[PDB]
Each structure stands twice: as structure tokens, then as C-alpha cells.
């Protein structure tokens, strides 16, 4: 378990999102999406959801665990659309 | 849904429909909501500490300070109705006594007695203004705070009557130095030096129950009996019809401050040990009030008799409260 | 005959003396008084430009209430309130909950100055200030109390500030920092100059046009009465600044000026903007929340500031930019999170509202319009459930407001984070973060709602738990003002 702060791309708002220490960038992204896609953001399934650290713009790879990301509790994450 | 109430939620279930007084004055301080952290900020700022030390940690204790009610039930609307009425009366007096030339008729020994005993009081009144304004910002319930509220604007009222008369008096007697000398008289004159130490020293009693007792219970009566009761008795036999009337008009304010003090003291005696807490503070301060009242009244015409009546009228105030 | 004011008015503030039985520092401690190494003598040079004396106060102010209470008793049985626009009912419920105990609290901030100022002129003007705020809190409890049998939400004119509802915490956060926990002089500046002179004096004039335009004459008479009292007290900060610029202290004066305007602005962008651009029914708008800011608030700041020998804050240009966004932020935050406030937020995004919004703020429909696109499509599609939230927003650690900024095609939401003594703090702006950093002992161990949440303090630790933590129950928690009636324009 772990708290993070989702900066979902093209949402208006940073939001509080619980994730698990055992997730993947991919499953993090998905947990964030629950709170932003089809609430205030339109699906882009042309597109891939990437997870990057808000503070220094570092992109984490789709496969990586939360638990090796070295995040601070509550750390702010960019949740992006590329491939 | 929650249903609409007939009154505020904190007044629900009274047998009796709340008054405008209760509607606008009760349960309004919100720093008392979280004693461990009064203000919505860091819990260690100086003001978090000032408020825990002097408000929450006061030896004078009650489970429910918000139950207090001001027996006069003043609100701002009422307070201006009452005091616009009283000031029509006192400004009418200034208007019409001037028209008559009342100031020109006073004896020169009286004029000199005013310069020394009357006009430096602007300092002693600003000081109780400050004193009661402090009580407002440290008291534990908004209905207590409100009493210090209207009382403070009364102390400023007496400062005001004094500023004005002191100017009228310099107009008539340009050589007395009315207007120029009160600070010195206040700083240096022995007749002032017991009041001055009573109030400089009371003005640093930060505990809201100690500020209360020392300003309201002990300083204001010694000041009221010295300056309103006995200088205006003296004014009146000495030919100064205006001061005589002025002083009795300001005594109307003083009696109201006492009605609310007496009520607070009542509410304090509900809890065990409060009397003792309050008797201990009176006994700390009373000696300085006896100094005050001797330095002052002794220098006045009829000296010892002024001392003796002021000392016991003042002390009868607190007597009457328990 | 009576004297002329000009002739005796000084003797009313000739009240300073040289203490003897206690020391000066004992009589005026620096944490209360805040005299800043400046002398009793230098401070006596302080000169309010609006004089008023006791008997004038009481006669003038007796007749301010005579009028206002009279107007109110006269329209009472008409009940305008039951026929008013609901974005207007809601403007008044938001008004009274957010400001009525904070008005009363300001008598203590007035009292602070009254006891502890070393300017004998501030102590007496702060004693009439103390009076005014007494009135303001009292009247703004008396007025709504008329409405209590109409709705539990009107009970929150009293109850709001006794709650950890987030907006309430955001208000206490502002007031406690500006006016409840500052030394005499800091308060004269932060509160009377920055906030009252700089914001609320105009806000309240506008506020009063809008009452009257909306058909609400009780509330028009109310607000514009209280506003005629703001000058006699808002003036107190001006003269303190002049004395601090003229003695060794321009920077300190500057620094509180910067702090207090940012903070005032932030409260303002959630409490006023959302109202002007979305709740005021379209045809009753004048100008935009941004046009109002540039014409009536910002110009004046530069004016005041220049004459004072001060500079525009370092943040000014950014501030300028943000009048395009921040309130569109706080609007969407609030409506989305409507069950978490005590009034019914009005969406303000009908077709017609949207072209208004587009010509005031070009880009709107491109950015803001997007989330509102999604949300609109959802209630058109019977998925209302995705128009209420499931988590909490990230809350600023300074203003205690949702971190929010441009969405859709020019997405620019940023969080200005700071790690300080093993804790991660979140800030909605460079300024929000700089308010913290210049004085972290002031803020450090405060916890915002989200913080609390994260720490175990809100239990059950889910949404319902938080509603309850915040003292909110059905019947007060907020919903769509116009009850999704505006959805119909879309089908
Ligand atoms: Fe006010
Ligand atoms: Fe004000």
C-alpha cells in the first residue's frame, strides 16, 4: 500500500490515489484513470498511459514496480498518453 | 435529509424561543474548539502558546463558559440606541452650559483643582480602555468577550468627554496649560502615582481570569469611586455643575460594567474552588487599590473622608458578589 | 455652543505615556505589539486620514441599523428567498457560512491592535474597528436566522467555522494567519490594508449590486450598510506601512504585503470568482470575474503601493496571468465535489453560459470546456454517478485549497512540492510555496484535511467517513443548484 498524487493528463485537478507497493507503472496508471478518464477526461485508446515523476519529469517504464520507484509517500505523479 | 430547525442547532431545546441577544452573541469563538491547537496553523506559534497559557490554563474554571449571559443583554444595535440617547443628554449639557458661560463662572482654586485632578484622567481612562480591550481578546466565550466589548467603547467614551472638556477648559483658561500638562501630572504627580502603578501593573496580568479581576473587580471600582463619585461630589459643592453631572452620567456606564462582572462572578461560584481563586487575586491587587485611592483622595479637599468612603464603596462592590 | 472637531480631536489620541512601574517591553510585548525596534515617539507620528469620535460613531451607526433592520422587517413576510434564483440562494449560504464568524473574529484582531498598538491613533481607530466587526458578525447572523426553518444549510451561518469542512478550514486558515496570530502592526497591514482595503471594500460594493440586480433588497441593504463601515477601519494599515518604510523597514513591510495579497487572492478565487462567472445568472453579468479584478482591485493595488513607496509583489505578472484560470479551477473543484460543501453549486455551463465564458476567457471551451464536455455527456447518458467523486483532491498546504489548473488542450496542472524535515508538502503555486518557506515555523506541523486522512485521523477512512468528519449529512451536503435542469439543452 501507498498513497500518491495523480496529476492525470488533461484533467484540471491533482487527486489523491492509493496504489499498492506491488503494482507496475501500468496498474498505477489504471488506478489513476479510474478517477479521471470518463469523469472529466475522454479515452484515448489510440494511446498508451505512461507514469512519470512530477518533480523532475522522469519517465518510469510500464513494467516497473512502485516498490522500486523510490517514491515518497504522497509523491506527485504525471499520468500521460503516449506509446 | 436533515430537517430545518426552529433556531440555531446550538440553541435547540430551550422550552423558550431564543432572544435576539442569544441569536447573535452565543457560542461564537472557535479557538476554544481545539485547545491543543487554537488557530488553524502551526501549534507552536507564540499566539497558540499565549492562548493556551492565558486562556485555557487559567485557574478560573468552568465546564461551559458559553452558558454566560450578559444580564443587560446588549447587542450592538441596543448599545447604540442606549448610548446615542445618553450622549444626546451629555452633549446637550456641554452645548447649553457653554451657552450660559458655565466655565467662566468657576473659581480660580477650582480651575486649579481641575488641571491636577480632572483632565489627566484621560490617561487613566485610555488605560482602562486597553485593559478591557485586552479582556475581550483573551476571554473564553463570545458572550464574555461582548461585555468587554461594550465596556471598552465606554472607557473610550469617558476618554472622549475628557479630551473635549479639556479643550473647552483651555479655551477659557489659556494659561493653566490644560492640554499640555496632563502627561506630567500623570507621570510625576504623587496624587496620580498609586493609580498609575495599579494600572501599569494590572495591564500586564495576561491570564484572562486575572485580567478580569484586576481590571473589573478591583481597578475599575477604585477609579470610579475616586474619579466619578468623589471628584464629582466635590465638583458639585464647588460650583462645577457640569462635572458634577458628567461624572454621574459616566457612573451609569460603570454600574453596567458592574452588573456583568457581578454576573460572571455568580457563574464562577458554580464551580468549587473558584471563590478561593478569585479571593486570592483580589487580595493580591486590593493593596494597590488602597495605595491608589489614598494617594488621590488625600490630596483632594476633605482628604481622609474621601479616602474612607471611596475605600468602602469600592470594596462593597465585591462584597455584594460573595 | 459646541467645539469644532478639528479643535479638540488630538487630545483624544494624546494617550501615550512613559511607563514606570512595568517596563515598556512588558507593557507592549513585541509578539503582541510588533513595534519592530521603532520608538514610541516615532510611532506617535501615525496619522489616520479618516477621523471619527465617539458620539458621531453611535449616532451614525444607530441610524445604519435603524435603516437595515427596517428594510428587513418590511420584506420579511414577502419571502423573496423562496422565489430567488437558486444560484443566488446558494450565494447567500456560502456568504454567511464563510464570513459571519470570521467577521466576529475580526473584532479580536481589532482588539489586538486596540491594546497593543504603540500608535495611540491606531488604538482608538481599532476600538471603533472592534465595534464595526462586532456589528458585522452580529447582523450577518441575525439576517440568515430568518431562513432557518427553510433549510438546514442556513444553520451553517453559525456552524461552518465550528467544523472541519474543507472550505471552513480554508477560511480559518486565511483569517488565523492574517489577523488572529499576528502582532498589532502585522495585523494592521495584512488585514486592514491587504484584505479589507485591497479586496473586501470593492467585493462588497459588487456583491451589493448583484443582490439588487437579483431582486434581493434585504441582502442589498445588508451588504451595502456593512460596506459603508469598512473605510473607518480599513484605513489602519496604510499609516503603519508609511511609518515602517520611513524607519529602517521597507522589506518587512513588503514581505507581509506580498504574503497577505497572495493569500487574499487565493481565498478570493474560490469564494468570489466561482460566483461571478457561474452562479450569477448570465443576463445579470456586467463583467467577468477577471474584468472586475483588473478594473477594481489590481489598478488600486499598484496605486496604493506606489504612493506608499512600496513595489508590486515579485509574483505580480503570474497573478495577472492566473485571472484567466484559478477560479475556473475552484469552480470545477467545488461543483464536482458538491456533496462536500454546505451550499448547492451552480454548474454555469449551459450553451449560452458557454459562449459568454468563451468570449470572457478565449480558450475556455478548448481547455475547461473539455471536462465539462465529459460531465455533460455523462448526465445526458444516465451516468450521473461519474459526476460525483470517489477520492479526495490533493489540498494545498498553504491555502488548504484543491490544486488545480488549465485542463484539456492546454493542460498545465502543476504541483509545487517541497520536502522539509522529512515531510512532503504540496503547493498550488510558486507563491503558495514561497509563503511557507519564508516562515516554516508558522506552518510546519499544520495538517490539511488530506494529511489528516492519510494519517489515520478520519475513520471510517473512506468518503462517508470524511463526510462525517466534516459534520456534513444529507440535507446540507451540496448538490446541483439548478438541479441538472440545464442538462436538457443537451438532451
Ligand atoms: Fe466587517
Ligand atoms: Fe472589516
Amino acid at each position: 500500500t501507498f498513497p500518491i498524487m495523480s496529476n492525470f493528463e488533461r484533467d484540471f485537478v491533482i487527486q489523491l490515489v492509493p496504489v499498492d507497493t506491488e503494482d507496475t507503472m501500468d496498474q498505477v496508471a489504471e488506478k489513476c484513470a479510474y478517477h479521471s478518464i470518463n469523469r472529466r477526461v475522454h479515452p484515448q485508446p489510440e494511446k498508451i498511459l505512461r507514469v512519470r515523476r512530477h518533480e523532475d519529469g522522469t519517465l518510469f517504464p510500464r513494467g516497473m514496480i512502485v516498490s522500486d520507484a523510490g517514491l515518497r509517500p504522497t509523491e506527485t505523479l504525471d499520468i500521460i498518453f503516449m506509446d | 435529509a436533515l430537517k430545518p430547525l426552529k433556531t440555531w442547532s446550538h440553541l435547540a431545546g430551550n422550552r423558550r424561543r431564543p432572544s435576539e441577544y442569544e441569536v447573535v452573541s452565543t457560542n461564537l469563538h472557535y479557538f476554544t474548539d481545539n485547545p491543543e491547537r487554537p488557530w488553524e496553523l502551526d501549534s507552536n506559534l507564540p499566539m497558540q502558546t499565549w492562548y493556551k497559557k492565558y486562556c485555557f490554563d487559567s485557574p478560573l474554571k468552568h465546564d461551559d463558559w458559553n452558558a454566560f449571559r450578559d444580564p443587560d443583554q446588549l447587542v450592538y444595535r441596543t448599545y447604540n440606541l442606549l448610548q446615542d440617547g445618553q450622549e444626546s443628554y451629555v452633549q446637550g449639557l456641554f452645548d447649553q452650559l457653554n451657552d450660559r458661560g458655565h466655565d467662566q463662572m468657576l473659581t480660580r482654586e477650582w480651575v486649579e483643582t481641575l488641571a491636577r485632578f480632572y483632565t489627566p484622567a484621560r490617561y487613566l481612562f485610555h488605560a482602562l480602555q486597553m485593559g478591557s480591550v485586552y479582556i475581550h481578546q483573551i476571554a473564553p466565550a463570545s458572550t464574555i468577550t461582548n461585555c468587554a466589548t461594550y465596556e471598552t467603547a465606554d472607557h473610550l467614551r469617558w476618554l472622549t468627554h475628557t479630551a473635549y472638556r479639556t479643550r473647552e477648559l483651555a479655551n477659557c483658561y489659556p494659561d493653566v496649560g490644560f492640554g499640555k500638562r496632563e502627561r506630567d501630572v500623570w507621570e510625576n504627580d504623587p496624587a496620580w502615582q498609586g493609580f498609575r502603578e495599579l494600572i501599569e501593573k494590572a495591564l500586564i496580568a495576561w491570564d484572562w481570569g486575572e485580567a478580569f479581576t484586576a481590571i473589573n473587580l478591583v481597578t475599575k471600582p477604585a477609579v470610579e469611586e475616586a474619579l466619578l463619585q468623589q471628584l464629582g461630589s466635590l465638583a458639585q459643592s464647588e460650583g462645577d455643575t457640569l462635572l458634577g453631572l458628567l461624572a454621574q452620567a459616566q457612573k451609569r456606564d460603570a454600574e453596567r460594567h458592574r452588573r456583568w462582572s457581578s454576573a460572571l462572578v455568580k457563574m464562577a461560584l458554580e464551580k468549587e474552588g473558584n471563590r478561593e481563586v478569585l479571593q486570592k487575586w483580589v487580595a493580591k491587587w486590593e493593596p494597590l487599590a488602597d495605595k491608589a485611592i489614598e494617594a488621590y483622595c488625600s490630596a483632594l479637599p476633605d482628604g481622609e473622608n474621601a479616602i474612607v468612603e471611596a475605600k468602602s464603596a469600592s470594596r462593597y462592590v465585591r462584597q455584594m458578589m460573595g | 455652543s459646541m467645539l469644532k472637531r478639528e479643535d479638540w480631536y488630538d487630545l483624544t489620541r494624546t494617550t501615550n505615556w512613559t511607563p514606570k512601574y512595568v517596563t515598556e517591553n512588558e507593557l507592549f510585548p513585541e509578539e503582541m505589539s510588533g513595534a519592530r525596534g521603532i520608538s514610541m515617539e516615532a510611532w506617535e507620528k501615525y496619522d489616520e486620514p479618516y477621523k471619527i469620535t465617539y458620539p458621531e460613531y453611535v449616532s451614525i451607526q444607530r441610524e445604519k441599523d435603524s435603516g437595515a433592520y427596517s428594510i428587513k422587517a418590511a420584506l420579511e413576510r414577502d419571502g423573496f428567498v423562496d422565489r430567488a434564483d437558486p444560484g443566488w440562494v446558494s450565494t447567500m449560504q456560502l456568504h454567511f457560512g464563510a464570513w459571519a464568524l470570521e467577521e466576529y473574529a475580526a473584532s479580536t484582531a481589532e482588539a489586538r491592535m486596540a491594546r497593543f498598538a504603540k500608535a495611540p491613533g491606531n488604538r482608538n481607530m481599532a476600538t471603533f474597528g472592534m465595534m464595526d466587526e462586532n456589528r458585522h458578525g452580529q447582523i450577518q447572523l441575525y439576517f440568515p436566522y430568518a431562513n432557518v426553518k427553510r433549510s438546514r444549510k442556513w444553520d451553517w451561518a453559525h456552524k461552518a467555522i465550528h467544523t472541519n469542512e474543507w472550505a471552513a478550514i480554508a477560511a480559518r486558515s486565511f483569517f488565523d494567519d492574517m489577523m488572529m496570530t499576528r502582532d498589532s502592526v502585522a495585523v494592521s497591514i495584512m488585514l486592514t490594508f491587504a484584505f479589507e482595503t485591497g479586496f473586501t471594500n470593492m467585493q462588497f460594493l459588487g456583491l451589493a449590486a448583484d443582490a439588487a440586480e437579483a431582486g434581493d433588497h434585504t441582502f442589498a441593504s445588508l451588504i451595502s450598510s456593512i460596506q459603508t463601515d469598512e473605510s473607518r477601519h480599513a484605513q489602519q494599515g496604510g499609516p503603519s506601512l508609511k511609518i515602517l518604510v520611513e524607519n529602517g523597514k521597507k522589506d518587512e513591510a513588503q514581505q507581509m504585503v506580498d504574503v497577505a495579497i497572495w493569500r487574499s487572492w487565493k481565498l478570493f478565487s474560490v469564494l468570489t470568482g466561482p460566483i461571478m462567472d457561474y452562479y450569477t445568472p448570465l443576463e445579470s453579468r456586467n463583467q467577468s470575474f477577471k474584468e472586475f479584478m483588473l478594473e477594481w482591485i489590481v489598478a488600486q493595488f499598484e496605486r496604493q503601493l506606489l504612493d506608499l513607496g512600496l513595489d508590486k509583489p515579485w509574483y505580480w505578472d503570474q497573478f495577472m496571468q492566473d485571472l484567466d484560470e484559478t477560479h475556473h479551477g475552484m469552480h470545477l473543484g467545488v461543483w464536482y465535489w458538491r456533496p462536500t460543501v454546505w451550499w448547492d453549486p451552480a454548474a454555469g455551463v449551459s450553451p449560452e453560459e458557454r459562449e459568454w465564458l468563451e468570449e470572457k476567457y478565449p480558450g475556455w471551451n478548448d481547455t475547461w470546456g473539455q471536462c465539462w464536455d465529459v460531465i455533460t455527456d455523462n448526465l445526458v447518458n444516465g451516468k450521473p454517478e461519474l459526476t460525483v467523486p470517489e477520492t479526495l483532491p490533493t489540498i494545498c498546504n498553504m491555502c488548504n485549497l484543491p490544486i488545480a489548473h488549465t485542463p484539456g488542450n492546454k493542460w498545465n496542472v502543476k504541483d509545487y512540492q517541497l520536502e522539509y524535515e522529512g515531510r512532503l508538502y504540496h503547493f498550488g503555486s510558486e507563491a503558495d510555496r514561497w509563503c511557507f518557506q519564508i516562515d516554516p515555523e508558522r506552518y510546519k506541523n499544520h495538517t490539511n484535511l488530506v494529511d489528516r486522512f492519510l494519517k489515520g485521523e478520519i475513520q471510517p477512512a473512506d468518503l462517508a467517513g470524511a463526510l462525517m468528519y466534516m459534520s456534513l449529512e444529507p440535507g446540507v451536503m451540496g448538490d446541483d443548484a439548478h438541479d441538472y435542469e440545464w442538462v436538457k439543452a443537451y438532451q
Side-chain angles (χ1 to χ4, degrees):
Chain A
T1 228
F2 201 67
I4 47 105
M5 289 316 193
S6 164
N7 187 21
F8 213 96
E9 152 186 33
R10 337 145 61 76
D11 214 333
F12 79 108
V13 76
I14 305 185
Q15 310 170 259
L16 160 70
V17 201
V19 283
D20 205 80
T21 52
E22 289 333 312
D23 323 335
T24 330
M25 292 325 163
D26 266 28
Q27 278 135 242
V28 144
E30 156 88 355
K31 285 203 207 116
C32 289
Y34 174 90
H35 287 302
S36 306
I37 312 283
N38 289 317
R39 278 169 186 293
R40 258 163 268 120
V41 185
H42 284 121
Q44 299 182 30
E46 269 275 313
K47 287 297 188 163
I48 267 162
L49 292 194
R50 295 294 298 293
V51 180
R52 66 152 153 152
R53 183 196 281 141
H54 186 275
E55 175 162 35
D56 55 353
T58 289
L59 192 44
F60 299 127
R62 316 178 36 169
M64 131 133 62
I65 19 157
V66 153
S67 173
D68 337 315
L71 302 166
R72 305 170 288 192
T74 263
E75 178 97 64
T76 285
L77 299 170
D78 290 324
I79 311 295
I80 81 185
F81 290 103
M82 350 108 129
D83 351 75
Chain B
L2 281 160
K3 274 184 305 192
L5 307 190
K6 359 158 50 35
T7 184
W8 301 128
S9 59
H10 69 87
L11 305 168
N14 276 15
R15 233 131 314 172
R16 25 141 290 123
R17 202 219 30 109
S19 65
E20 166 189 32
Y21 173 71
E22 285 166 301
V23 166
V24 293
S25 318
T26 60
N27 287 245
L28 304 191
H29 282 165
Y30 67 73
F31 74 98
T32 49
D33 286 336
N34 315 78
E36 338 67 4
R37 186 193 310 246
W39 312 103
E40 193 61 60
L41 286 155
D42 173 306
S43 66
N44 295 120
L45 295 155
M47 199 70 65
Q48 290 276 31
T49 308
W50 179 287
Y51 273 78
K52 283 184 295 159
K53 188 158 148 105
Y54 297 123
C55 179
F56 292 112
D57 282 350
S58 162
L60 189 80
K61 325 217 231 164
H62 197 290
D63 285 333
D64 204 3
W65 283 119
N66 284 297
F68 177 78
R69 297 285 178 276
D70 151 27
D72 283 78
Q73 270 163 263
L74 287 170
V75 306
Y76 174 98
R77 204 192 49 82
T78 60
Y79 167 89
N80 297 140
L81 272 186
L82 205 199
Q83 296 294 68
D84 187 52
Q86 298 293 311
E87 273 309 81
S88 296
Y89 166 74
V90 174
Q91 310 278 330
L93 264 221
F94 297 168
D95 192 24
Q96 288 182 48
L97 289 181
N98 171 86
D99 274 328
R100 213 146 100 153
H102 153 293
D103 285 1
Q104 307 61 196
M105 310 309 312
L106 321 147
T107 74
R108 193 199 31 106
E109 336 97 50
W110 198 244
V111 175
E112 263 162 17
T113 304
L114 287 186
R116 172 171 191 208
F117 301 90
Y118 170 68
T119 63
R122 81 167 167 259
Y123 284 105
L124 176 36
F125 301 163
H126 188 56
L128 295 169
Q129 200 186 316
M130 283 182 49
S132 71
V133 104
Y134 184 72
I135 288 155
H136 168 140
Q137 84 199 69
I138 198 76
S142 64
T143 53
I144 303 164
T145 279
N146 270 191
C147 285
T149 309
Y150 300 135
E151 165 182 326
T152 312
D154 306 335
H155 317 301
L156 174 56
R157 182 199 185 205
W158 293 6
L159 164 66
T160 303
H161 296 332
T162 303
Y164 183 101
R165 295 287 287 131
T166 286
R167 173 62 60 221
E168 284 215 296
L169 268 171
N171 276 353
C172 207
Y173 301 110
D175 60 304
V176 180
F178 290 114
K180 270 143 173 165
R181 269 95 137 123
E182 292 67 39
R183 188 177 179 162
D184 297 335
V185 179
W186 177 246
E187 297 172 8
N188 294 290
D189 177 319
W192 292 101
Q193 276 341 273
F195 285 115
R196 199 193 172 206
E197 164 182 30
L198 166 64
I199 203 62
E200 289 183 352
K201 258 173 179 155
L203 287 178
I204 70 184
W206 307 125
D207 184 276
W208 95 263
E210 187 170 33
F212 188 56
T213 274
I215 298 306
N216 271 34
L217 296 165
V218 194
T219 311
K220 281 174 64 65
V223 172
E224 283 162 16
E225 297 306 318
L227 277 71
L228 315 168
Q229 185 56 47
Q230 299 296 318
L231 177 91
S233 247
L234 186 68
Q236 199 204 321
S237 42
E238 215 84 353
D240 196 348
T241 135
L242 200 162
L243 188 33
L245 279 168
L246 187 49
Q248 152 186 7
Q250 301 174 311
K251 195 98 211 263
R252 273 182 92 76
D253 292 347
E255 303 147 35
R256 144 166 82 253
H257 315 160
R258 282 162 200 187
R259 280 190 298 269
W260 83 247
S261 286
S262 157
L264 186 59
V265 168
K266 200 189 160 146
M267 159 177 222
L269 315 192
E270 292 179 346
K271 195 102 179 10
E272 227 127 62
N274 274 347
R275 201 184 315 248
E276 311 59 67
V277 141
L278 279 168
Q279 285 165 333
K280 183 193 207 156
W281 283 333
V282 169
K284 176 182 177 181
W285 295 96
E286 236 197 21
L288 280 165
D290 293 353
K291 269 137 92 320
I293 273 133
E294 307 156 3
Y296 182 86
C297 281
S298 83
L300 271 191
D302 229 315
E304 324 309 299
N305 175 53
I307 294 170
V308 165
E309 306 207 70
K311 278 187 201 197
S312 79
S314 88
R315 153 175 310 144
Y316 192 66
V317 179
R318 297 185 285 288
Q319 216 168 120
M320 287 322 92
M321 295 160 189
Chain C
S1 299
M2 307 285 302
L3 299 188
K4 279 139 72 31
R5 196 177 64 204
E6 11 297 300
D7 292 341
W8 63 272
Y9 182 97
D10 296 2
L11 289 150
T12 74
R13 34 175 205 198
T14 308
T15 58
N16 270 2
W17 69 102
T18 284
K20 159 140 135 103
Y21 306 81
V22 297
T23 66
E24 186 163 337
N25 283 342
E26 294 186 309
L27 188 74
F28 297 98
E30 176 74 16
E31 69 198 271
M32 301 293 248
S33 238
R36 283 156 174 90
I38 302 184
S39 55
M40 184 162 283
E41 184 168 65
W43 272 106
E44 306 172 345
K45 245 173 79 73
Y46 173 106
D47 189 44
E48 63 267 34
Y50 312 131
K51 299 171 176 33
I52 188 159
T53 70
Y54 191 74
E56 304 177 327
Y57 182 82
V58 309
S59 70
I60 295 174
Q61 302 283 127
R62 155 183 187 154
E63 294 299 276
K64 292 190 189 167
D65 282 344
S66 278
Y69 284 68
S70 273
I71 290 157
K72 171 191 171 272
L75 319 182
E76 182 123 312
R77 271 226 210 78
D78 184 68
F80 163 83
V81 65
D82 325 293
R83 323 195 293 271
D85 185 283
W88 187 253
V89 180
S90 306
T91 293
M92 289 188 279
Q93 308 168 324
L94 164 58
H95 177 79
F96 280 133
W99 317 113
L101 276 54
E102 303 289 15
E103 297 265 26
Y104 184 75
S107 57
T108 300
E110 291 285 344
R112 193 79 69 230
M113 273 191 302
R115 186 24 181 103
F116 298 100
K118 273 187 179 164
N122 199 354
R123 292 193 304 271
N124 286 38
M125 292 299 96
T127 307
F128 303 112
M130 181 199 59
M131 297 283 293
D132 297 341
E133 312 293 19
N134 180 278
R135 187 193 182 218
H136 300 175
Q138 292 197 169
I139 201 176
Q140 292 199 98
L141 276 169
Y142 192 66
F143 272 56
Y145 174 85
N147 287 333
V148 281
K149 314 194 302 284
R150 310 172 155 98
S151 176
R152 201 88 148 216
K153 312 158 151 55
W154 290 107
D155 185 72
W156 280 57
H158 198 285
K159 176 191 184 73
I161 305 294
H162 298 299
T163 74
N164 301 303
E165 188 273 341
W166 60 280
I169 291 156
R172 296 192 302 260
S173 169
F174 185 62
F175 290 109
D176 288 11
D177 185 8
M178 301 301 87
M179 92 169 183
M180 315 301 280
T181 65
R182 292 310 182 152
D183 71 59
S184 176
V185 171
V187 169
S188 66
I189 299 158
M190 296 186 79
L191 169 62
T192 74
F193 175 77
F195 189 61
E196 302 178 288
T197 293
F199 283 86
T200 65
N201 200 38
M202 297 299 124
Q203 159 197 13
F204 256 60
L205 246 6
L207 175 56
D210 302 330
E213 184 108 52
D216 202 326
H217 303 297
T218 295
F219 181 98
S221 303
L222 164 102
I223 284 331
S224 82
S225 215
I226 287 175
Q227 126 87 18
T228 72
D229 295 342
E230 200 82 36
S231 293
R232 108 212 351 141
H233 69 249
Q235 75 173 316
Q236 267 151 316
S240 286
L241 288 170
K242 258 176 87 310
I243 125 152
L244 294 164
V245 155
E246 276 179 295
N247 291 89
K249 320 259 152 162
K250 180 166 58 179
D251 294 348
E252 293 71 353
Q254 186 81 54
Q255 212 204 252
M256 330 183 235
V257 167
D258 293 342
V259 176
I261 303 185
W262 187 263
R263 300 227 42 202
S264 296
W265 155 242
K266 290 309 296 268
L267 189 64
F268 215 65
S269 65
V270 51
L271 288 162
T272 308
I275 261 63
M276 294 190 78
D277 276 11
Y278 299 86
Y279 299 50
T280 297
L282 201 199
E283 72 271 27
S284 281
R285 318 196 186 157
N286 28 292
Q287 69 204 346
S288 73
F289 177 63
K290 172 173 156 213
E291 288 174 328
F292 167 94
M293 296 281 317
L294 283 165
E295 157 156 31
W296 296 116
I297 298 302
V298 169
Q300 296 72 350
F301 266 130
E302 335 221 27
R303 175 71 302 186
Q304 296 280 228
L305 276 176
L306 186 106
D307 293 338
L308 257 335
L310 295 160
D311 309 341
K312 306 144 173 188
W314 64 263
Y315 57 77
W316 210 253
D317 284 318
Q318 184 58 65
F319 176 29
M320 292 293 218
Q321 292 159 238
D322 298 350
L323 309 159
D324 284 303
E325 313 296 344
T326 311
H327 73 283
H328 297 298
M330 312 281 177
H331 192 48
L332 179 47
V334 158
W335 178 84
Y336 201 77
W337 265 269
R338 45 180 191 299
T340 80
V341 307
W342 68 86
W343 66 98
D344 276 359
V349 285
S350 76
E352 313 92 312
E353 314 174 290
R354 283 192 65 160
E355 34 200 45
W356 187 97
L357 286 156
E358 186 74 28
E359 77 182 64
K360 303 302 181 169
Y361 312 87
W364 193 95
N365 257 304
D366 174 74
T367 63
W368 309 99
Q370 304 305 285
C371 322
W372 281 113
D373 293 327
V374 186
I375 289 161
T376 289
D377 296 341
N378 279 114
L379 285 137
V380 191
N381 291 320
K383 301 144 153 169
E385 74 269 348
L386 287 73
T387 72
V388 278
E390 270 171 49
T391 197
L392 286 183
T394 311
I395 290 296
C396 188
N397 279 301
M398 175 58 52
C399 62
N400 278 257
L401 307 162
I403 303 185
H405 218 51
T406 333
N409 291 284
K410 344 293 308 348
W411 193 58
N412 202 18
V413 179
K414 312 169 150 320
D415 170 349
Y416 294 82
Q417 284 162 314
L418 160 96
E419 166 173 0
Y420 179 79
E421 310 181 334
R423 171 144 172 227
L424 195 51
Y425 302 81
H426 304 90
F427 299 114
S429 54
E430 184 64 65
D432 281 274
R433 179 172 68 206
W434 167 85
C435 292
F436 198 89
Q437 276 185 288
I438 53 161
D439 197 8
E441 313 297 335
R442 179 157 275 267
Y443 307 104
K444 272 191 185 175
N445 74 19
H446 177 258
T447 60
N448 79 41
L449 187 45
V450 163
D451 286 336
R452 281 173 226 173
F453 201 90
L454 288 196
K455 252 180 91 204
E457 322 198 328
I458 302 193
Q459 283 308 322
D462 55 15
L463 238 289
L467 285 155
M468 212 49 159
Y469 183 71
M470 285 193 313
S471 305
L472 298 167
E473 291 171 44
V476 359
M477 331 148 42
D479 212 347
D480 190 79
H482 285 105
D483 190 352
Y484 318 93
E485 168 77 25
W486 53 278
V487 165
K488 304 183 183 201
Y490 302 94
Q491 266 208 97

